[PDB]
Amino acid sequence: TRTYDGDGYKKRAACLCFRSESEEEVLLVSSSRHPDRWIVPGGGMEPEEEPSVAAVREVCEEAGVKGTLGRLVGIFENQERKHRTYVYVLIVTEVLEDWEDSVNIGRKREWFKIEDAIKVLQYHKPVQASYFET
Ligand SMILES: O=P(O)(O)CP(=O)(O)O[C@H]1[C@H](OP(=O)(O)O)[C@@H](OP(=O)(O)O)[C@@H](OP(=O)(O)O)[C@@H](OP(=O)(O)O)[C@@H]1OP(=O)(O)O
Numbered sequence: 001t002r003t004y005d006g007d008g009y010k011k012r013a014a015c016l017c018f019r020s021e022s023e024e025e026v027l028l029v030s031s032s033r034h035p036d037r038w039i040v041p042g043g044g045m046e047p048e049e050e051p052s053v054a055a056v057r058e059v060c061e062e063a064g065v066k067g068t069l070g071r072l073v074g075i076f077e078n079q080e081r082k083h084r085t086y087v088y089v090l091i092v093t094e095v096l097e098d099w100e101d102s103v104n105i106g107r108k109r110e111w112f113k114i115e116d117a118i119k120v121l122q123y124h125k126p127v128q129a130s131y132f133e134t
Pocket residue numbers: 030031032033034037039081124
């Protein structure tokens with residue numbers, strides 16, 4: 001079930017899934033609509049679902065990783081799509097091999113240096129590139 005803020009923006013949660021506490025490498029996933037495009041994993045919050053819980057669930061489903069939830073980075077609007085996304089740091093401790101979106105839609109995942117993640121997100125997802133601005 002899709003959920004919305006009082007202003008009609010769709011509620012979403014995402015994680016910056018880092019390889020380590022050094023936060024030098026981040027996990028991106030392929031778009032289901034355009035498999036040649038990289039995105040930050042995330043998705044819709046369920047009714048009464050805490051944003052930190054939604055963020056962890058969505059990175060499990062989309063990226064097949066689990067780890068240690070860290071700080072809220074911020075709340076980011078995509079005006080064009082009317083999305084409002086809570087973005088958390090996650091330090092990856094488990095990389096699972098046969099995850100929901102691999103099985104179901106062949107979603108891919110790849111580690112990026114932060115500078116390269118910003119580069120590949122800039123064109124289609126400038127708001128996601130801004131998640132890394134700190
Ligand atoms: O959830 P996904 O697919 O794995 C990743 P996304 O949300 O970034 O994909 C969006 C895609 O974004 P992208 O593939 O760049 O991640 C964008 O692509 P755009 O046309 O370049 O804006 C649109 O796709 P289409 O071109 O197929 O309509 C969006 O369609 P909407 O009209 O908003 O429904 C897609 O939204 P979707 O419905 O798939 O969630």
